Structure formats: C-alpha cells, structure tokens
Amino acid sequence: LDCLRQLVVVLCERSQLQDLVEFPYVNLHNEVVGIIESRARAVDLMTHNYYELLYAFHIYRHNYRKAGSVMFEYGMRLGREVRTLRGLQKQVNSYLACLNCLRLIRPEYAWIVQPVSGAVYERPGASPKRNYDGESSAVPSSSQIEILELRDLEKEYVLAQTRLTLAKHNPSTAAIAGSSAAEEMVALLVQAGLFDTAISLCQTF
C-alpha cells in the first residue's frame, strides 16, 4: 500500500497519466481509487486535474456509475470552493459529463449515492473536533445517505447552467450566483432581465 501510494504520486507528478489508467490493479483497484480520491480531496481544484484523472480511470474500465459520482462530487466542490466564471464553467461541464455517464447506464442503475448536505466530511487527518471540555466529540453515527436519480441531477445541472448564464452576462455576479438557491437565482435572473431562463428555472423547480 505504501509503495502503491508512492507509485500513484510519482506518476501524477511526472504527468504519466496513461500508464496509471492502463495498469490492471488486480485486488488494488479500491486502494488506488481511495488514494487518488484522498489526493483529489486534499488538493486545490484549479491547479491539479485529479478528478478528471479519476473520471478517465473509471471511463477506461467502463465503470460509468463511479465516473458519474466522481464528476458530480467535482461539480459540487467547484460550486462550494471555486466561485469564479471558470469554476462555474468547469462545474457545468462536470455535471454534463455525469449526466452523459448515467445515460450510458441502464435506467434501473442510473443513481448516485451522496452523504446529505451537512455531513461533515472530516478532512482525513483533521484533529478530532474537541468540545470545550477537551473530549473527542462522538462522530454522529448517521451519515444519512441521499440517493440522487437522473431527474435530480438534471435539476442541479440546470441550476449550475443558469448560474453560468448569469455570471457570463455579469462577471461581478459570479461570487453571489455560486451560492444562490433556486429561489434567490430567480430573483437575480429577474434583476438581470433574463426572464426566459428564470421561467425555465421556475418550471424545473
């Protein structure tokens, strides 16, 4: 596992991404995915392409479901962390890539698994959140799991696309648009004068 961690790091630093995708990883596949996911979680979203690598890695092995899940996680993190015009454009592209992956799957299996919005992803290696009394707060033992269907991903895609259309029309709004709920986004589109996009958003939500 430590040699595998070193191999994945050195190949990513050398930009030898093809070899990393083509290797068979007999029984080590989940560990490689876990290492690249842990690094994709630790690194800045604008400087290194680890989500695009995880996507290429899953597409090459015909694992369209995990490929969709990774690109959806990428789109969600871009929406939270990178409130720039370029971040919103990458977010729309990652949700589109997710939708395309799920459309290649049979409709019966076309669902992604998410921990509910508010599940603290403890950064692996964050000091345990101590209460005021210095005790380790017991991990809330129910990461409620939300199952997202293709229709809910289409709503999130339309919401990201409407955020991008507003940010393209006024680049100063990109910071506000990135956090706006569907209701706030209708109010912002109405102020800009983008009524058809506001109507489309009202119909979808």
Q: Closest by alpha carbon to 103, among 157, 163, 49? A: 157
Residue closer to another protein, measured from CB, 41 or 169: 169
Q: Is 169 in the site for another protein (CB under 8 A)?
A: yes
Please spell the DSSP secondary structure of 50-115, one letter per residue: HHHHHHHHHHHTT-HHHHHHHHHHHHHHHHHH--SHHHHHHHHHHHHHHHHHHHTS-GGG-EEEEE
Tokens, residue 21: 């995708």
We find the least distance from the C-beta atom of residue 101 to another protein, in angstroms, to be 33
We find the least distance from the C-beta atom of residue 183 to another protein, in angstroms, to be 11
Q: Is 173 in the site for another protein (CB under 8 A)?
A: yes
Distance from C-alpha of 67 to C-alpha of 74, rounded to nearest angstrom = 11
Size of the site for another protein (CB under 8 A): 8
Residue closer to another protein, measured from CB, 81 or 122: 81
We find the least distance from the C-beta atom of residue 197 to another protein, in angstroms, to be 15
Q: Is 175 in the site for another protein (CB under 8 A)?
A: yes
For the CA atoms of 94, 63, 45, 169, the dihedral, rounded to the nearest 10 degrees, stands at: 0
Give how far Cα 96 sits from Cα of 21, 90, 107, Å: 22, 10, 17
Among 30, 47, 172, 203, the residue binding another protein under the rule CB under 8 A is 172
Residue closer to another protein, measured from CB, 149 or 184: 184
Q: Is 141 in the site for another protein (CB under 8 A)?
A: no
Q: Is 171 in the site for another protein (CB under 8 A)?
A: yes
Distance from C-alpha of 30 to C-alpha of 67, rounded to nearest angstrom = 14
We find the least distance from the C-beta atom of residue 169 to another protein, in angstroms, to be 6
Q: Is 185 in the site for another protein (CB under 8 A)?
A: no
Residue closer to another protein, measured from CB, 131 or 179: 179
DSSP, collapsed to helix, strand or coil, labels residue 159 as helix
Q: Which residues bind another protein (CB under 8 A)?
A: 169-176
